[PDB]
């Protein structure tokens, strides 16, 4: 029955940040609420008129409506065409990875405090949406006064094809085809599926969730082979198989996690076993407060390697620019530059090519690449729920101290670098500053402060504790034994407990 206005009126708090806005399910489900943020992202395409839009999510409840709003919204725009998937599925990398084969305007991705609605924003390049756009977003999303949509009759995606609604296109595309394509020019799917089929050696992860889902179930089993139940659907870790080394299958078995740290030093080591990178890795980047492992290996291998602040954000401009091949963050996985998002899937392929190559379990590769290029022991301490500005009080105390630091011996630690961290893009001259206060030391150890959630009642005070060890017999202690020493030290100098009344960290990772 056509298009139509609709009078709405602003809502407080759409403001996206990292991931897009993630509120509670009914939140999203106040009336006009979705409407709201989803004209206030249309907003700022210009251009729609022969553009193509690209949409899905993860199943999970509220979605399906979610994507018929959307749909309806998009055709009142003008877009000539919206790529949706089948059943409205759709992963992250996938859609990055279709936004970027058929030069789409972009994407919405509907996936996510654990239960929560998230809609998140991909620009034209297939990455996350850059904060000049996401505060853009925000702004509009109070001043609004109406929205626009197609009134009309839901839109079925139980089967492929192309539907009208409206003058635009509803496109219904396999969820896996085009990402699976991409996945096989990387690496040997042939020898991927002659490991598990041996079955001798366990499955490899860095990213939580990465072996579970239906991506992992058409990739991981239906083609490559696996035994059913080998997927979850909606973990032993690789140090513990390394201290335990001084006929059934193995990938149905227990999943070996690698931290997304090492992962990316050891996927780098290994690269140029594996089709997609045989040529060789431009550089390497990781964000600052992640280990230094993968700083050893793009040492040998004699190329540069970028430390950039948190997120997979400024990973974008190294990426296009072709300065940086793989990249990882601390806590959250690893990537390349076939897509513009952590790909975990990716890892675990990446992973299972190396095992097919070099035939050897997970903790001799790990031991190995210890005994080559030293162990970069690595924990976070967080402290939750810190007031306001006494977090704000130690930073500034600290930072205060930081130039009477330098040259200085501190029990077994000689600092080379005290400094607050700041980012020069090599590519947008954008300069990004104050992003976490860096004690680096001379034998390649580190103490890393950083402060997040600063907009909340409280703040959270993060601590990365970093020890290089390249004794090979010191390889394996457990690592908050190998961190005791820097730990204390990273709790005096800070003044942490006196300053905050904490005794104990919240989390240790």
Known sequence: ??????????????????????????????????????????????????????????????????????????????????????????????????????????????????????????????????????????ERSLALTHYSIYTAPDVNLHTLGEFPLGEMIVEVIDPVADYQALLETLFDFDRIAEVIRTGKLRLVFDAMHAVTGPYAQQILEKCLGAPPGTVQNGLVYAHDLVQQLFDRNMILGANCFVTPSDSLAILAANAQLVPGYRDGLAGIARSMPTSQAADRVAAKLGIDCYETPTGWKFFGNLLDAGKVTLCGEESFGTGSNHVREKDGLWAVLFWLNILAVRQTPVAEIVKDHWRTYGRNYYSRHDYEGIEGDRAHTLMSQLEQKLPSLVGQTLGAYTVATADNFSYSDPVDHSVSQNQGIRLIFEDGSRIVYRLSGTGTQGATLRVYLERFEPHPSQQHLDAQVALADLIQLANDVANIQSLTGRDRPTVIT
């Open 1 to 138: 029955m056509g298009i139509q206005v609709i009078a709405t009126t602003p809502f407080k708090d759409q403001k996206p940040g990292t991931s897009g806005l993630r509120k509670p399910v009914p939140v999203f489900q106040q009336p006009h609420y979705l409407e709201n943020f989803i004209q206030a992202i249309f907003d700022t395409i210009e251009a729609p008129q022969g553009q193509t839009l690209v949409l899905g999510g993860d199943g999970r409840y509220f979605n399906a409506e979610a994507i018929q709003v959307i749909l309806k919204m998009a055709a009142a725009k003008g877009f000539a065409r919206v790529k949706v998937g089948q059943n409205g599925i759709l992963s992250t990398p996938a859609a990055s990875c279709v936004i970027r084969k058929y030069g789409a305007v972009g994407g919405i991705i509907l996936s996510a405090p654990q239960g929560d609605f998230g809609v998140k924003f991909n620009i034209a390049n297939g990455g996350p949406a850059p904060e000049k756009v996401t505060n853009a977003i925000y």
